[PDB]
Structure formats: C-alpha cells, structure tokens
Design a protein around this nucleic acid. Structure first.
Ligand code: NA
Ligand code: NA
Length: 327
DNA sequence: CATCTG
DNA sequence: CAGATG
C-alpha cells in the first residue's frame, strides 16, 4: 500500500503505455498482474531477483525493478514521458468519444492538439464533436450543490410524465459525496420487467420531456434502454450560466431494480465485501439479482426484491445507509 | 454491455 | 458485420 508503491506505480505507467501507444495488450496486461501481485506483497522489495520470485514476475520486469530501485528512475519511462507522439495519445484520448484507437489515427494524421481538432472537425463524429465542444465543462467536477438541483428537476419531470416512474440517482451522489463526475439515473417502471417484452417509449418518453424543458442539451447515444447525454441547469438571471454535464439514464425492468440500485451505488469495495458475505450466507449477487446458492457447486433462481432492504435481509446483514456504504 | 460507425 | 467507446 506504500511499501512497494513506486514499483507498482512505474509498472502502471508501463502497462498503461503498452496498451495505449503500442498496441501491446499482452505486455500491457503483463505489467498489470505484476503491479497487482507486488501490491499484495507483504514486504519491502529490495531487489529484482526478489521480486522475480513472484508469479507474473519475470525477467524483464525484474530488470526494470532493479534499475528503478538502483536509480530514482527508469530510462524507458523517461524516454516515453517526453515523446511527443506518446503525449499526444494521452491527451487526445481526453476527449469524450476519442479512445486510443482513434487517438492513433489522428496523430498519424498529425492531429495532436485541440486546435488540430477544431480545424479538423470534419473528421470527428457526433459524440467526438460534442466531446470537443464540451472539453472544459467535461472535466469540471460536479458539486453536490448542483447535483441536488439537477436531481430535483429530473425527478419532477419524470414524475410528470408518469406517476408510476421510479427514478434514482446512484453514484457517490447517493453515497454522500461532495461532488461528482457525471449524473447517473436508474430508471424503471412497473410495466417493465424481466419477461415483459419491451416498452422503449418508457425511456424515450422521459428523454423527451427532459429536452422539452431544456435540461437535456445534446444526445451522445440513445438506445432503447440506455441513454448517454448532456444536460444543463438553467442559467438563472444571466451572468452565471452552468457547465455542461455528462448524464445518463437507463431503463431497468422493475424486477431487478434494487440489485441495480445497490450495485450502481457502490462503492466497489462495499460491493465486493457485500458480495463475498452474500456468498457465505449461501448466496450470489450481481448487478441484476440475488440467487440462493445450491451446494452441487453452484445453482440459481432469482430471489424476490422489493427494496435494498430485501437484499441485505437475505444475506442477513445490517441495512446500510448509503452513506456508510463506503467500504 | 449497449450503442454507433462505416 | 467487427470493432470502438463509454
Ligand atoms: Na476519451
Ligand atoms: Na479478430
């Protein structure tokens, strides 16, 4: 956690770079299990050879650990930190819609900067375009104070369209968090479940309203269950307009809402732990359901959940306010 | 995993 | 359709 830090750290720069600049999924994937194991490693890695001893730990890595331990740095890591092309990709990638894949193509076309990007707006697709228009706004954290305002609206409108709608704002906003990165809404309606063959309108109807009143600014992707967009709190009495914010809304059959709600709420750590205990208690849990575990190895059969309460109860645990859902 | 692109 | 992004 801080004994073998720099090590796990450099390993990460390295793995990251593999995958993003080179195509090196293997290699990349290599550094990864590597940093994972040294991570768990209970001692102070004093040499490569020592490390080597570990699984996932081969010769090349060993080599690097040595040099790193040997000297406050690593050459390759130094060489990669300068490299314009390397930096290029790390940056372009910052744009929503631009991934690595694309980041390469661009660079090899010589698009490296923001300006490059504007100039070549023709090469970008819708998402990427938006992604570029909202670069700044996009990176700006979302303070809870707006969060609550947003949430307020979304909920009101959803209600308007249908009283039977059940919306929830998961994420850290849900966990207490003072700011968030984007807005995540879990949606369901009684009329929608596991078997119930579709009802796309269910999602589309709301989306509409959201743009009706202008909360929703642009559409990133709009499928029949998942929507990826942009929103914005009405700039009041003009002088201070708001940033644009990432927002998503997803339909979910009523019959697997809570697992979802739970799940989406996190934290990752809370999940796991809860996930593991569930398991002891003779259960299983994933994003959609809770199933009673048979003994023949495994087994299933969706346990019935009417709340987040229903879940814990099953696994016979202490109902956790979202706030203490931390770890 | 679900959506988009081409 | 594979293949990219989130
Ligand atoms: Na990106
Ligand atoms: Na292939």
């Amino acid at each position: 956690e801080t004994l073998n830090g720099g090590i796990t750290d450099m390993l990460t720069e390295l793995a990251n770079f593999e995958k993003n600049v080179s195509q090196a999924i293997h290699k990349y994937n290599a550094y990864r299990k590597a940093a994972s194991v040294i991570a768990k490693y209970p001692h102070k890695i004093k040499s490569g050879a020592e490390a080597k001893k570990l699984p996932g730990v081969g010769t090349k890595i060993a080599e690097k650990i040595d040099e790193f331990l040997a000297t406050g740095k690593l050459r390759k890591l130094e060489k990669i930190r300068q490299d314009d092309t390397s930096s290029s990709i790390n940056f372009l990638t910052r744009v929503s819609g631009i991934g690595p894949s694309a980041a390469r193509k661009f660079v090899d076309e010589g698009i490296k900067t923001l300006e490059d990007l504007r100039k070549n707006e023709d090469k970008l697709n819708h998402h990427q375009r938006i992604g570029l228009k909202y670069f700044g706004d996009f990176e700006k954290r979302i303070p809870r104070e707006e969060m609550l305002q947003m949430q307020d609206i979304v909920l009101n409108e959803v209600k308007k369209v249908d009283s039977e709608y059940i919306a929830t704002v998961c994420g850290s906003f849900r966990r207490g968090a003072e700011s968030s990165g984007d807005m995540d809404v879990l949606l369901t309606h009684p009329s929608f479940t596991s078997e119930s063959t579709k009802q796309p309108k269910l999602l589309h109807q709301v989306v509409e309203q959201l743009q009706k009143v202008h909360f929703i600014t642009d559409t990133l992707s709009k499928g029949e269950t998942k929507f990826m967009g942009v929103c914005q709190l009405p700039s009041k009495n003009d002088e201070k307009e708001y940033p644009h914010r990432r927002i998503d809304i997803r339909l979910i059959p009523k019959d697997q809402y809570y697992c979802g709600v739970l799940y989406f709420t996190g934290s990752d750590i809370f999940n796991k732990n809860m996930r593991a205990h569930a398991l002891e208690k003779g259960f299983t849990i994933n994003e959609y359901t809770i199933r009673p575990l048979g003994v023949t190895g495994v087994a299933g059969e969706p346990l019935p959940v009417d709340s987040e309460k229903d879940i814990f109860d099953y696994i016979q645990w202490k109902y956790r306010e979202p706030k203490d859902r931390s770890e």
